[PDB]
Design a protein around this ligand. Structure first.
Ligand code: CDL
Ligand code: CDL
Ligand code: PC1
Ligand code: PC1
Ligand code: PC1
Ligand code: LMT
Ligand code: LMT
Ligand code: LMT
Lengths: 117, 52, 149, 188, 93, 82, 71, 122, 71, 71, 71
């Protein structure tokens, strides 16, 4: 026969075939444990990503709300005309700053919600 | 001791002609029959109620 | 041409289930030994056990008044020391004596030890579930103290 | 980044050119159509077979290649099996280099290969020797057993129980993407 | 077409930013032979000799019989070469 | 495929779709416990059973809260004291 | 409830340490645009990636400030 | 040193022999008995092998199921039948009336059947 | 244990040197992509290696911090 | 018992400084590669040696930190 | 009670500073090699000499820290 010369070399011991049945060097429970550990440790990336996403989502809300509250304090406190004249430009700066933050958030959100497939 | 695994065991399927899209394209006729029959039943009931 | 004469939709269902199961066996065979056994048996099994136990059994947070009343856990492994606030799952038929024995490891407990919940002492021939239902509804925090008085 | 160059004149050349033939002295050695089969030369013919004849009555296809000696050894007993069992099945003879799309269809990875087909996926059994232990008689015995099995299963349950499977909806597009043209789907 | 190829490459390829290449202990045929060029050669010479055949029919995964025979032949060769080296290559010095 | 913006959905799926088998198992166990309770009730009981209650310890010698019944040592002309 | 506030104030130093680094990144972007205006894109992508890293560090330190401030 | 590294290699390959014997035994006992037939194999071929075969197609994220719909741009004279033409003429604009009706119905149902909440009475 | 919260804050102050380092790295990367653009494939790779170190160090500076915040 | 903790926090800060130095080395290597691509291997090897020494110092600091957490 | 530990931590900070100093050395090395490889061996020797001095100072600092730890 063609392969009898090779298949004559394949004769094993009782202990050999017991060891193969148990799968000593082919199951590798240490490798299984390493996989489980690495897989559970890889859950940190989800937390990182959600943190980044929420910050980029609330950045415009902050620029619109908390700096707004600060401007509201200044408006409540100021009375004269010179300070008000000077403060109008701060308000306009806040307008431009809000639009800048909105642009930044748009950029990061199209980066974070872009999928290949 | 060599490769024990083939390539398709690792590599991702086709991007545009994949298993699910081929499957659902095959099941399209049966789903059309199902939902058309259900919609026709509902429509006939509502019409039988609304006409009189 | 949908359907064939002489064949049943139930026969087709059986066909489909056979196909799916054969494909699953093929994909499990041609897979990594390192990952598949874990991901298919050990995580599902642990998740099943945890979820079933939580959704079905009912548990209690146990505290002890004094460090002198703490159990001896030096010998048993994976817990060398008592910590208060331990979540303990019990059966509906459990009594205070059974709970006390479970805490103290089937060993000689101290004298005049009693259980309380929201300041209310339990009898030892009492069902823990009904006693909690009566005294501390939806606040199962139990406390073990010494009743000398 | 993975790429393969498109092709070469060598690759696109005729895979099966003619070679010189000896005089009638080299043939003198110590070891010294067919009316029952069909030699297939065209994927059109192969598709016609697989999609009509394999639904009427089963087919047995031998995929070979010229370089292989096992194919040469297996050819004659395959012809005897064909002469025996042509009443119950059809018999085809395919060269992998001449019709590769037929080889990709049948999912043959080594040559020679027997393929018993019915309904194009209701029964597909591939017989081969990937190791190099079997012989031609072993292959033909396995083919006879498979043919008997598929015939029995077709008779079983009023002609049914042999319906096509994944090819019902796949059309062998994951195996050979060129079937999208057959189905008429766009490629734009 | 270029987007298709770039997407599939970024997803499947072995890289410094790997998407799918992860938790690798048993490699597939292509990656195995790409990383271990010594084994591609040995597995290929055996295939052409054990079966007079073309490289175009090279199997995806070889049989365990072939692998075991290869290991036995490796035993033979390393035994002979090592014993030759032990005798002659070190009596030099 | 995926992205950083889908971390919420990825985490939720990975942690919750494996729990669905356990949820269905819990539902089935609940139905079986209800079936057994109703079969017991049809068979008959000395004291009643509350169906939608967690635990029913009541018997001839036990209250509906797990304590011994008061005034249960003797026998009564009208039968059970409950 | 004074040590929590002091801990948060001490944790806020990395914000100032990160602003340095964002400054250097955008300075490098400016200089690269001055040296090769033919490449505006393919510099802003790398700038945004590194800035994203430093933004993540800022998020870390501010988060931990709020943590120690309430725990 | 020579002695020691040589004997190191010797029992390295001894362990290799043991590994090979158990490998053979594992295979021929367990895996040749548990091997799948091949009937339920994966119904596809990897994109690299298709690319080497010259078989890969990349296009058409979408498809056209019916030949009537496939041959429209090639017919040039009847891309749509007459019946189809008059059926298409009914959808030159979206129906704000139908939008309004369906939205009012869905809002009514969602509000007065699905989103009822209690209110105090004095 | 308020001193725990203080130690943690101090352990987070290190982000100020980390981010600085990262910034310098990416600045040099941008300069390189503005000087010899045709070898980004090299520069980005080297940058990723550097980040693979710096990231790791920062993660340690978080981890130990949290450890001193709990233990 | 937090007095040991502060020492650990300080060690972490030192580690951050080491990280900053590592980033500086990476930045210099990238610039060098951009200026002289053909000599990358030698420069890379030199950087590797520097990185190894820096890593050793960082490990030493982390170790001492752990020791100071307990002893 | 743990003043010695605090002193050891301070010494560690000094070690971190030394590492930062080393970074400039090896940056100059990876730059002078890019600018003249033919004299790179000489440059490497000078860099090694400087590195050795820096390492020596660090070792001295560590010895001082150990003495401080042990009073
Ligand atoms: C206790 C221990 C617990 C541990 C588990 C123990 C074992 C238990 C059984 C298995 C449980 C694990 C199941 C995992 C399957 C999913 C992922 C996976 O691992 O697959 C890998 C495995 C290998 O993947 P692969 O090798 O990479 O690719 C090969 C292809 O899959 C090869 O595929 P193909 O080419 O041969 O055929 C294409 C295939 C495509 O398969 C795929 O490759 C992708 C599948 C997509 C999955 C995600 C879909 C989710 C979509 C969202 C649903 C939205 C619905 C919207 C509804 C709105 C309508 C109002 O088509 C299908 O068969 C899929 C059918 C299911 C999709 C249904 C989607 C809706 C369409 C409805 C059609 C009508 C019904 C069927 C009609 C047929 C006649 C009855 O997948 C398969 O082998 C086949 C797909 C699996 C299909 C489901 C099989 C049945 C599972 C039963 C689950 C029941 C569990 C509850 C147990 C009871 C507890 C109390
Ligand atoms: C509170 C909401 C509750 C549900 C949750 C919401 C889920 C859906 C979200 C949808 C969001 C989309 C955005 C709005 C779309 C706007 C544009 C648009 O619709 O185009 C016009 C378009 C008009 O269509 P057209 O292109 O002019 O076609 C007219 C043909 O001539 C007509 O002739 P024909 O030959 O086409 O057929 C005649 C007739 C009937 O058809 C026939 O030919 C006869 C057969 C009919 C018999 C069966 C009836 C159907 C089934 C029963 C339905 C009712 C009760 C079910 C009871 C159950 C069993 C008892 O046609 C229809 O009935 C149209 C079907 C309407 C279905 C909606 C359209 C599909 C959209 C997909 C939605 C996704 C849902 C998932 C599906 C479920 C899971 C698989 O509007 C619609 O028809 C859709 C109505 C939209 C629904 C209202 C939802 C409110 C939207 C809010 C937006 C505002 C946001 C901010 C709010 C704050 C404001 C201050
Ligand atoms: C991948 C997806 C990416 C998504 C990116 C998301 C980022 C952008 C999110 C910003 C949303 C903010 C808009 C809502 C806040 C304003 C509320 C409001 O309208 O007040 C009632 C306004 C103000 O009315 P009023 O002030 O005169 O009096 C009434 C005010 N109330 C009722 C509040 C008391 O109503 C209007 O009359 C508006 C008419 C003018 C148009 C206003 C729109 C311009 C300003 C906002 C633009 C923001 C988008 C910038 C996009 C930049 C992207 C490049
Ligand atoms: C109940 C809520 C459902 C809502 C979500 C699902 C969408 C709603 C629409 C209905 C879903 C089902 C659509 C089925 C479409 C497949 C039709 C089809 O022909 O398939 C080919 C099969 C196989 O056919 P065949 O291969 O035997 O013979 C025909 C061969 N061809 C196709 C070549 C002509 O056809 C059938 O025999 C009937 C299958 C459909 C009936 C089963 C429904 C499946 C849904 C339940 C899933 C679980 C299965 C196990 C149930 C066990 C019951 C105890
Ligand atoms: C509103 C709901 C919307 C969401 C939809 C919810 C439903 C669908 C959600 C599915 C999403 C998650 C699916 C992920 C599936 C992951 C499982 C998996 O793949 O396993 C990992 C293994 C790992 O394989 P691998 O490690 O070789 O390769 C995996 C990927 N790489 C290469 C990157 C590592 O995958 C498999 O090969 C096996 C999968 C098929 C088997 C599935 C389990 C059932 C097994 C039953 C047969 C048991 C035979 C026992 C015989 C023993 C003797 C040999
Ligand atoms: C293929 C069919 C699969 C269908 C799924 C069927 C559910 C499979 C899981 C059944 C496990 C039954 O295991 C059994 O569960 C119940 C509830 O936890 C436990 O019972 C425990 O809670 C119940 C409810 O109060 C009481 O009996 C008692 O309090 C206590 O004994 C049993 O101690 C345990 O032996
Ligand atoms: C194989 C067995 C059947 C398989 C099908 C399983 C699906 C069951 C899910 C339906 C939702 C169940 O959700 C809830 O569970 C049980 C009934 O099951 C009921 O629960 C209530 O009645 C049951 C009686 O059976 C009592 O045991 C239970 O103490 C009480 O809380 C609720 O009225 C129902 O809302
Ligand atoms: C003009 C006819 C058109 C056809 C419309 C027919 C639609 C019928 C669908 C009814 C389904 C509503 O489903 C039902 O909604 C109400 C809310 O309103 C819920 O009501 C729930 O919350 C309310 C308020 O706390 C309480 O009454 C109670 O706690 C509970 O019943 C029910 O738990 C839910 O089962």
């Amino acid at each position: 026969r063609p392969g009898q010369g090779s298949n004559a070399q394949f004769q094993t011991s009782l202990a050999d075939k017991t060891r193969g049945l148990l799968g000593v060097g082919f199951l590798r429970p240490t490798k299984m444990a390493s996989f489980a550990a690495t897989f559970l440790l890889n859950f940190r990336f989800y937390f990182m990503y959600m943190a980044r996403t929420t910050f980029q989502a609330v950045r415009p809300l902050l620029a619109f709300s908390v700096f707004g509250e600060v401007m509201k304090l200044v408006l409540a406190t100021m009375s004269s005309g010179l300070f008000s004249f000077l403060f109008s430009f701060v308000l306009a700066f806040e307008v431009f700053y809000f639009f800048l933050q909105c642009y930044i958030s748009y950029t990061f959100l199209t980066m974070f919600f872009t999928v290949l497939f | 001791f060599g490769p024990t695994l083939p390539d398709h065991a690792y590599y991702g399927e086709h991007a545009t002609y994949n298993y699910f899209v081929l499957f659902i394209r095959g099941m399209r006729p049966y789903l059309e029959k199902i939902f058309g029959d259900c919609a026709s039943t509902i429509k006939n009931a509502a019409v039988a109620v609304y006409r009189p | 041409p949908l359907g064939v004469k002489g064949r049943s939709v139930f026969a087709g269902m059986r066909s489909f289930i056979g196909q799916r199961l054969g494909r699953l066996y093929d994909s499990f065979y041609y897979s990594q030994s390192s990952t598949k056994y874990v991901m298919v048996f050990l995580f599902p099994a642990g998740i099943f056990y945890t979820r079933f136990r939580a959704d079905t059994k009912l548990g209690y947070h146990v505290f002890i008044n004094e460090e002198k009343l703490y159990p001896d856990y030096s010998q048993n492994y994976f817990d060398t020391k008592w910590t208060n606030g331990r979540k303990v799952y019990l059966d509906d038929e459990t009594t205070v004596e059974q709970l006390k024995a479970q805490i103290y490891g089937g060993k000689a407990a101290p004298e005049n030890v009693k259980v309380a919940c929201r300041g209310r002492v339990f009898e030892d021939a009492d069902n823990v579930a009904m006693a909690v239902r009566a005294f501390c509804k939806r606040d199962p925090r139990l406390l073990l103290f010494q009743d000398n008085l | 980044s993975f790429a393969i160059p498109p092709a070469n004149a060598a690759a696109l050349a005729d895979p099966l050119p003619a070679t010189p033939t000896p005089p009638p002295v080299f043939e003198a050695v110590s070891s010294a159509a067919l009316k029952n089969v069909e030699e297939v030369s065209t994927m059109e013919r192969y598709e016609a077979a697989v999609y009509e004849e394999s639904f009427k009555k089963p087919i047995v296809c031998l995929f070979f290649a010229r370089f292989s000696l096992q194919s040469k050894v297996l050819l004659q007993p395959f012809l005897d099996f064909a002469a025996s069992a042509s009443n119950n099945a059809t018999f085809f003879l395919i060269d992998c280099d001449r019709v590769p799309r037929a080889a990709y269809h049948a999912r043959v990875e080594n040559v020679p290969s027997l393929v018993v087909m019915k309904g194009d996926d209701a029964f597909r059994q591939t017989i081969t020797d990937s190791v190099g232990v079997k012989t031609a008689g072993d292959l033909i015995q396995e083919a006879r057993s498979a043919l008997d099995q598929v015939l029995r299963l077709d008779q079983q349950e009023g002609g049914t129980k042999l319906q096509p499977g994944v090819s019902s909806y796949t059309h062998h597009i994951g195996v050979d993407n060129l079937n999208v043209y057959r189905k008429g789907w766009p490629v734009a | 077409k270029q987007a298709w190829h770039s997407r599939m490459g970024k997803f499947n390829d072995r890289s410094d930013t790997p998407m799918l290449y992860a938790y690798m202990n048993e490699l597939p045929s292509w990656e195995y032979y790409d990383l271990h060029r010594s084994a591609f050669l040995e597995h290929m010479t055996y295939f052409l000799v054990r079966t007079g055949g073309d490289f175009r029919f090279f199997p995806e995964m070889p049989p365990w019989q072939w692998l075991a025979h290869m290991e036995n032949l490796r035993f033979k060769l390393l035994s002979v070469a090592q014993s030759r080296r032990s005798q002659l290559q070190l009596a030099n010095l | 495929s995926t992205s950083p913006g889908l971390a919420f959905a990825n985490l939720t799926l990975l942690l919750d779709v494996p729990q669905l088998p356990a949820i269905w198992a819990v539902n089935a166990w609940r139905e079986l416990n209800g079936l057994f309770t109703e079969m017991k009730t049809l068979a008959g009981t000395s004291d009643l059973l509350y169906p939608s209650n967690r635990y029913n310890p009541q018997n001839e010698k036990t209250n509906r809260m797990g304590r011994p019944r008061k005034y249960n040592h003797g026998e009564w002309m009208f039968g059970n004291s409950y | 409830a004074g040590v929590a506030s002091l801990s948060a104030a001490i944790a806020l130093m990395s914000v100032g340490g990160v602003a340095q680094g964002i400054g250097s990144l955008f300075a490098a972007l400016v200089s690269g645009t001055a040296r090769n205006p033919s490449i505006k894109e393919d510099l802003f992508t790398y700038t945004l990636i590194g800035m994203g890293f430093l933004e993540f560090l800022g998020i870390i330190c501010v988060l931990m400030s709020a943590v120690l401030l309430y725990s | 040193i020579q002695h020691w590294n040589k004997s190191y290699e010797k029992q390295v390959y001894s362990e290799s022999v043991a590994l090979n014997r158990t490998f053979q035994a594992r295979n021929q006992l367990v895996l040749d008995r548990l091997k799948p037939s091949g009937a339920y194999r994966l119904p596809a071929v990897d994109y690299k092998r298709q690319l080497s075969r010259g078989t890969l197609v990349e296009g058409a994220d979408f498809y056209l199921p019916t030949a009537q719909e496939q041959q429209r741009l090639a017919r040039h004279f009847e891309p749509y039948s007459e019946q189809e033409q008059e059926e298409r003429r009914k959808f030159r604009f979206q129906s704000i009336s139908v939008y309004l009706a369906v939205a009012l119905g869905a809002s009514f149902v969602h509000d007065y059947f699905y989103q009822r909440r209690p209110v105090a009475w004095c």
